[PDB]
Amino acid sequence: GAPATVTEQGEDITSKKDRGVLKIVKRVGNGEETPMIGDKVYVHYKGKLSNGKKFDSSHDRNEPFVFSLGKGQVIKAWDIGVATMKKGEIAHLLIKPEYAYGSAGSLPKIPSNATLFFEIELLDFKGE
Ligand SMILES: C=CC[C@@H](C(=O)N1CCCC[C@H]1C(=O)O[C@H](CCc1ccc(OC)c(OC)c1)c1cccc(OCC(=O)O)c1)c1ccc(Cl)s1
Incomplete structure (x- = not known):
């Protein structure tokens, strides 16, 4: 599994x-x-x-x-993960609750103490 x-x-x-x-x-x-x-x-x-x-x-x-x-x-x-990404890059992130929604969760989608997984593609970024 990814x-x-x-x-x-x-x-x-x-x-x-x-x-x-x-x-x-x-x-x-x-x-x-x-x-x-x-x-x-x-x-x-x-x-x-x-x-x-x-x-x-x-x-x-x-x-x-x-x-x-x-x-x-x-x-x-x-904020941590996308900061490390280059233009055009595709990354996988696995994330413990403490860096996502924690024990609060975000019911009913996200339960308490949920681990999350993402595939992110950075298309571009532009200055403040
Ligand atoms: C519909 C589900 C939400 C989705 C999710 O978890 N996110 C969406 C993509 C970005 C990461 C993450 C997220 O930060 O969710 C946030 C949820 C709100 C939030 C923001 C900041 C937070 O901490 C500083 C936060 O802490 C709990 C929650 C989000 C959702 C949608 C838009 C957004 O910013 C742009 C805008 O407001 O227009 C941001 C997931 C997808 C699959 C999952 Cl399993 S969890």
């Missing part, structure tokens, strides 16, 4: 090194530049529970998912 590969071979990109966010690069993006705090980022993604018992995908709006990086507009794992 999740299993991230467990075994994913890099811990957390500052605390608690394996709360693990990452594999599935397709290399271009150049060296990755986005700074405050950059506008454009992604496609899809996501599911570590189980997969729930599943959701941006693509259904053929328009990109857009947010300002590093400003708390998304769960912590995304």
Whole structure:
């Protein structure tokens, strides 16, 4: 499973090194530049529970998912994870609850203490 590969071979990109966010690069993006705090980022993604018992995908709006990086507009794992991504890159993230919704969850979609999995494609990013 794509999740299993991230467990075994994913890099811990957390500052605390608690394996709360693990990452594999599935397709290399271009150049060296990755986005700074405050950059506008454009992604496609899809996501599911570590189980997969729930599943959701941006693509259904053929328009990109857009947010300002590093400003708390998304769960912590995304501010951490998307920051490490290059233009055109596709990555897998496996995320412990503490970097997502925690024990609060986000019912009824996301239960308490849920692990999440995402495939993210970084389409572009532009400066504050
Ligand atoms: C419809 C389900 C939501 C989806 C999900 O978990 N996210 C959507 C993509 C981005 C990551 C993550 C997320 O940050 O959810 C957030 C949920 C709200 C939120 C934001 C910031 C948070 O912490 C700083 C936060 O903490 C619990 C929750 C989200 C959803 C939709 C849009 C958005 O920002 C752009 C905008 O507001 O226009 C942000 C999942 C998909 C599959 C899953 Cl399993 S979980």
